[PDB]
Amino acid sequence: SHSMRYFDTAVSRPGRGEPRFISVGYVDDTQFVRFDSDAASPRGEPRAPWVEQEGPEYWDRETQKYKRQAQADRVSLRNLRGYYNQSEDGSHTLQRMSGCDLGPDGRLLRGYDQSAYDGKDYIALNEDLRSWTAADTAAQITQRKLEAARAAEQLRAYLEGTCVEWLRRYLENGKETLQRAEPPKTHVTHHPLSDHEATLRCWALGFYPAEITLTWQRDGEDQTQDTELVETRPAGDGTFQKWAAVVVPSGQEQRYTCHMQHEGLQEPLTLSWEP
Amino acid sequence: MIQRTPKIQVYSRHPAENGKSNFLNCYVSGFHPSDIEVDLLKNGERIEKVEHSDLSFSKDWSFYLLYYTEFTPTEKDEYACRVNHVTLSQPKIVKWDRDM
Amino acid sequence: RYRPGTVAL
Ligand SMILES: [Zn+2]
Ligand SMILES: [Zn+2]
Ligand SMILES: [Zn+2]
């Protein structure tokens, strides 16, 4: 399910300068662009090779939109800092996710534009793409300010045209890396903790994209309660790693299987500890 | 405010054989706010040529970074990742186990 | 390509 997402973060440093704006753009789980306002001469830079090609107008313009967005966020913080009568001396965070899910027919599936203040849902754009939702009274104040401006009109035109159109172009320009599926490489391990039990840990390595389901099963029955399951982590080279682990009483290792679902595999993989 | 303490994982890019070049990764996820200090250690002391990813965050708004460096493992050398944040009273030093 | 400019919150 192909996707482009931009992840903005504006943090106030009240007694040390203007707030810092940082933005990163992803196509699926592959980063392609950044903007850091603490960079020496701040500009939007390429972070993947399938967008390094883009001309000067492209990069000058993105930079131009980024600098103007950083000004609105500083302002947005300044305002919201007011709307909870918060001291002008604690640091505060505004976060935003904007982007596109693509469809089967190269069409729009779902557009996003959501925010959060101090790590918490503040205001979001609804599925229809012309109405908002707030979390408290303070985000009602914004909802009027955004309906007045007709923001949901100009975002709908963005994420129904530009985002889908330019996503399709990125997918085609970086086809060699963006539209391969590299399914997981797997093994299971056995570490004794005592005379009477052992951790069984199922490993998935070298996979892309990051969406993966690992589960342990005792005689068909999922062990959702007992399964320690680390967050998926990048390998550093474009691929991902994850494991799932379950403490089993020794003697019963053969009743356990590990089940694995990933885009790169057409069938579920079933895996066991063979001594 | 709403604050979340970092999960830290220290691992290599590929399974580590001695004398073969590889990358040491220290992945920090699920934290908030964003300000965070991270150093990678070799036998106790800091490593200097450390790179890092740009600040991003998950579905639940919590941040993640990757700090990584090329290295060449050795039976005797010990590695770790030091991690300071607001939610910690004291900097956490996490030892690289070799298990993958 | 990034979102277009919208009024502050
Ligand atoms: Zn595809
Ligand atoms: Zn025992
Ligand atoms: Zn026991």
Domain boundaries A181-271, corresponding CATH code: 2.60.40.10
In single-letter form, the type of residue at position A42 comes to P
> What distances in angstroms separate CA A215 from CA A37, A194, A226, A256, B34, one per listed residue?
42, 24, 10, 10, 31
Q: How far, in whole angstroms, is CA A155 from its chain's centroid?
A: 20
Angle at A63 between CA A57 and CA A67, to 5 degrees: 145
Top CATH class, A1-180: alpha beta
For B19-87, give the secondary structure using H, E and C. Answer: CCCEEEEEEEEEEECCCCEEEEEECCEECCCCEECCCEECCCCCEEEEEEEEECCCCCCCEEEEEECCC
Calpha distance A254→B6 (Å, rounded): 35
Edge-to-edge strands, sheet with B92-95: B45-46, B37-42, B79-84, B92-95
Cβ contact A126:A134 at 8 Å: no
> What distances in angstroms separate CA A201 from CA A79, A192, A198, B24, one per listed residue?
49, 11, 10, 21
Q: Which residues of A64-90 are buried (b: 16+ CB within 10 A; e: fewer)?
A: ebbeebbebbbebbeebbebeebeeee
Q: Which residues of B37-51 are buried (b: 16+ CB within 10 A; e: fewer)?
A: ebbbbbeeeeeeeee
CB-proximal residues (5 Å) to ion ligand 1: A 179
Lookup: tokens for A77: 């913080």
CB-proximal residues (5 Å) to ion ligand 2: A 194-196
- Residue range(s) in chain A whose domain bears CATH number 3.30.500.10: 1-180
Question: Which residues of chain C from 1 to 9 reach within 8 Å of chain A, CB to CB?
Answer: 1-9
Calpha distance C3→A161 (Å, rounded): 11
- Residue range(s) in chain A whose domain bears CATH number 2.60.40.10: 181-271
Cβ contact A153:C4 at 8 Å: no
Calpha distance A17→A62 (Å, rounded): 24
> What distances in angstroms separate CA A148 from CA A103, A119, A121, A142, A238, one per listed residue?
31, 26, 22, 10, 43
Calpha distance A125→A96 (Å, rounded): 11
Calpha distance A226→A217 (Å, rounded): 10
Is the CB of C4 less than 8 angstroms away from the CB of A65? yes
Calpha distance A29→A168 (Å, rounded): 16
**DSSP string across A95-147:** EEEEEEEE-TTS-EEEEEEEEEETTEEEEEE-TTSS-EEESSTHHHHHHHHHH
Lookup: tokens for A69: 């967005």
Give the determination technique.
X-ray
Query: What domains, with CATH codes, occur in chain B?
Result: 1-100 (2.60.40.10)
Calpha distance C7→A132 (Å, rounded): 14
Ligand 3 center to A225 CA (angstroms): 16
Calpha distance A239→A259 (Å, rounded): 20
Ligand 1 center to A64 CA (angstroms): 31
